[PDB]
Amino acid sequence: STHFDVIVVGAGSMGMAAGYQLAKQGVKTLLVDAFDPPHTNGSHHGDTRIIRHAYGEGREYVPLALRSQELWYELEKETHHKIFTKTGVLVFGPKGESAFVAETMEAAKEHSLTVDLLEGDEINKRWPGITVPENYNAIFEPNSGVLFSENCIRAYRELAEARGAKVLTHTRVEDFDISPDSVKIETANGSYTADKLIVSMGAWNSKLLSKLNLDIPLQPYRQVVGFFESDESKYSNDIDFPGFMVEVPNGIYYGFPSFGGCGLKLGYHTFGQKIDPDTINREFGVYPEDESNLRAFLEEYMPGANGELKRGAVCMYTKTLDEHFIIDLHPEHSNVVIAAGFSGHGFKFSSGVGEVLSQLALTGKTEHDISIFSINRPALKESLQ
Ligand SMILES: *Cc1cc2c(cc1C)nc1c(=O)[nH]c(=O)nc-1n2C[C@H](O)[C@H](O)[C@H](O)COP(=O)(O)OP(=O)(O)OC[C@H]1O[C@@H](n2cnc3c(N)ncnc32)[C@H](O)[C@@H]1O
Ligand SMILES: [Cl-]
Predict the structure, then answer these.
(1) In degrees, to the nearest 5, what angle opens at C-alpha 147 toward C-alphas 146 and 148?
(2) Which residue of 32, 237, 308, 384 has the fewest CB atoms within a 10 Å radius of its CB?
């Protein structure tokens, strides 16, 4: 017997930020999640996430990245949970052979971002512990860094709940009933109605958007990360070892300095197993590639960080065909907002995305330019049933 102004289905990275933005404005909000966020079944665990401003995936993301950065600094002041450490982020690759490095550089010039350019031995000299070939170049961004993702979601949840948002946990939404002036969700624990709906189910968008008559290629991937015992005199955040995202011959890798001796953390971005979010094996090490793809990079480029494996985590990406996000109104229902396909690089924007989703749900528009995320773009290959 409780109607809400807005219902958010999937209270993870994007949904919880939207919840916070809505509650902050006195909008009566219900957030429904299959688990109890933050948790380890979706796409936000593993402790840390890189935030970069000069953007190799595309200079068009810079404004949202800068706005999200300002929002993370705001969240830091609002909660007791740790949000952001300014490790700086290093990007490198073989000279003239990395579109990612090249666009990162173009993006920095175009938006007058503060960065250092260096190459070859200068990289190895500046950061003891990194060993790249002399034909590599790099762009270092000193003011970007690392977000503590589970902390972000927990903080947004606590702040939203304090302002009246309701969070219904361990409740899987199974179907939707959309009409011109209201929305309704169906779950085993009951059904709920509101004026607006935000759909942000992460990897499960690939299985449940068809319940909203949408047919968009969204492929979930199993992506692991490992924490390794390292030489702390070289890889500690305390001695300014940076976060990094780099391109080598076999693909892109990303990583984090050791924080409080937790060990250097590394992930291989280019490869992952195609999986289903309900049958993915969440145990690290069950595939030999889990650990060997990581050590292959470490022994070659960060040799002092290739010690004993201290911890592993398994998490998921949800890729669109062009690897750009989907943030838009449902093409047939202006009272339904969709947030999907973050393709392994959406967390850093979740604060800004929460803002965009709030604006779309409340007004049908946003002050942000989000055309590159249009649900109607051809490169997406979208359609209705
Ligand atoms: C996995 C991964 C991702 C990643 C990364 C490293 C790994 C191993 N490193 C990143 C980085 O350094 N920087 C960055 O900017 N991004 C990075 N990523 C990507 C980022 O984590 C993802 O793009 C982001 O987390 C996506 O957020 P989204 O909100 O889409 O996904 P979620 O946090 O998993 O939340 C979805 C929630 O919805 C719930 N759910 C699912 N189905 C239902 C149903 N049926 N009913 C109700 N709730 C549902 C989930 O339980 C989840 O909480
Ligand atoms: Cl993702």
Answers:
(1) 125
(2) 308
The verdict on 190 and 279 lying in the same domain is no
CB 174 within 8 A of CB 167: no
Backbone φ/ψ region at 376: left (φ over 0), alpha (ψ -120 to 50), beta: alpha
Picking from 294, 154, 276, the residue whose alpha carbon sits closest to that of residue 220 is 276
Q: What distance in angstroms lies between residue 147's CA and the mean position of ligand 2's atoms?
A: 16
| Per-residue burial over 31-44, b = 16 or more CB atoms within 10 Å of its CB, e = otherwise | bbbbeebbbebbbb
For ligand 1, say whether the CB of 42 is within 6 Å of any of its atoms.
Answer: yes
| Helix or strand holding residue 109 (H, E) | helix 99-110
The resolution in angstroms reads: 1.8
Determine the residue type at 262: C
336 is in an annotated binding site: no
Spell out where 161-292 has E strands.
166-168, 173-179, 182-187, 190-199, 214-215, 219-228, 243-248, 251-256, 264-268, 273-274
**Domain identity same for 102 and 196:** no
Largest CA distance in the chain: 67
Ranges of H-type helices in 143-191: 149-162
Position 82: which residue type?
K
Residues spanned by the domain of 109: 60-145+213-321
Positions of E strands within 24-163: 29-32, 48-51, 84-85, 89-94, 116-119, 136-141, 145-148
Name the residue of 9, 13, 48, 90 whose CB sits within 8 Å of the most ligand 1 atoms, as the mutation to test its pocket. Answer: 13
The residue whose two tokens read 């998490």 is 315
Q: Specify the residue for token string 């604060």.
A: 351
Contact 100, 108 (CB under 8 A): no
**157 and 265 assigned to the same domain:** no
The DSSP letter of residue 270 is: S
d(CA 208, CA 324): 20
End-to-end CA distance of the chain: 32
Do 55 and 61 touch, CB atoms closer than 8 A? yes
Q: In whole angstroms, what is the distance from residue 44 CA to residue 315 CA?
A: 8
Q: Give me the helices (H) in 137-192, please.
A: 149-162
